[PDB]
Amino acid sequence: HHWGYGKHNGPEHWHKDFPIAKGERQSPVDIDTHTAKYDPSLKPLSVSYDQATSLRILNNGHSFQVTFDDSQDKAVLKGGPLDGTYRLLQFHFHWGSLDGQGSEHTVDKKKYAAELHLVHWNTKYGDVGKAVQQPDGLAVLGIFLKVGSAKPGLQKVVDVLDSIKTEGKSADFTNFDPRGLLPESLDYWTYPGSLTTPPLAECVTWIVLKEPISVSSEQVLKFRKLNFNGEGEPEELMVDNWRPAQPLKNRQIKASFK
Ligand SMILES: [Zn+2]
Numbered sequence: 001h002h003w004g005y006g007k008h009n010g011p012e013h014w015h016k017d018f019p020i021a022k023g024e025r026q027s028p029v030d031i032d033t034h035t036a037k038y039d040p041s042l043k044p045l046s047v048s049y050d051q052a053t054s055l056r057i058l059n060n061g062h063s064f065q066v067t068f069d070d071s072q073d074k075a076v077l078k079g080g081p082l083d084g085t086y087r088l089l090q091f092h093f094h095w096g097s098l099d100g101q102g103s104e105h106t107v108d109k110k111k112y113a114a115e116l117h118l119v120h121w122n123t124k125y126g127d128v129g130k131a132v133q134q135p136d137g138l139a140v141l142g143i144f145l146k147v148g149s150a151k152p153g154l155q156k157v158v159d160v161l162d163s164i165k166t167e168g169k170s171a172d173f174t175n176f177d178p179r180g181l182l183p184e185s186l187d188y189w190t191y192p193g194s195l196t197t198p199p200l201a202e203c204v205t206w207i208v209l210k211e212p213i214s215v216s217s218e219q220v221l222k223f224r225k226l227n228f229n230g231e232g233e234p235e236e237l238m239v240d241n242w243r244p245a246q247p248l249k250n251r252q253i254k255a256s257f258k
């Protein structure tokens with residue numbers, strides 16, 4: 001009985017109640033490698049996750065999310081296009097009903113099997129609730145998933161999804177090191193955008209890594225066995241929880257690499 005990814009409530013309908021859906025800095029977008037230009041002014045990007053403290057994993061009926069203790073500069077993201085310090089709040093994924101789709105961003109119109117989002121907030125604004133009201137309030141680090149060999153860093157996640165099958169279910173989820181989900185290269189594209197779900201707020205600097213991570217066909221299949229619904233409600237399997245690419249309009253996608 002609210003927005004989702006179904007026949008009634010999915011991305012094609014969100015504009016009926018979230019008019020910013022047709023706005024001037026919406027996400028995701030297609031990243032055209034012929035027009036996304038190298039920017040020599042981009043400063044080095046610093047992913048600092050060695051102090052990350054994971055807390056819980058939750059199925060909220062839109063995705064599953066892993067939360068972190070962001071109460072001090074534990075896990076942070078700095079540099080790149082960003083000014084100051086952004087703290088890691090949570091991560092979650094978007095994925096498809098089959099391997100040939102599921103990512104939100106695309107590259108030369110190619111869809112990946114899934115996309116990982118590491119959500120960070122700008123400490124200049126003091127807290128998340130203030131940050132999300134500002135155009136530079138959040139930075140989301142996006143990582144593509146392709147099907148290949150199994151990803152060891154995803155094992156802990158895969159092993160607990162059966163315990164959070166339905167909407168509202170959560171589990172303790174400590175000592176998860178998000179570095180295991182990063183590719184070797186931190187080469188990236190960046191542009192100003194929005195949340196890719198309602199409320200679609202235009203408060204995000206996107207940093208999308210060029211190198212995908214490979215996960216096994218079984219690992220991404222396990223994401224597809226989660227339920228959008230709650231316990232006792234009839235089953236609706238959690239798949240195709242991605243928004244398609246939106247018009248770039250008056251924005252430039254910058255590459256960190258030549
Ligand atoms: Zn109602």
Ligand SMILES: [Zn+2]
Nearest residue numbers: 092094117196
């Ligand atoms: Zn997301």
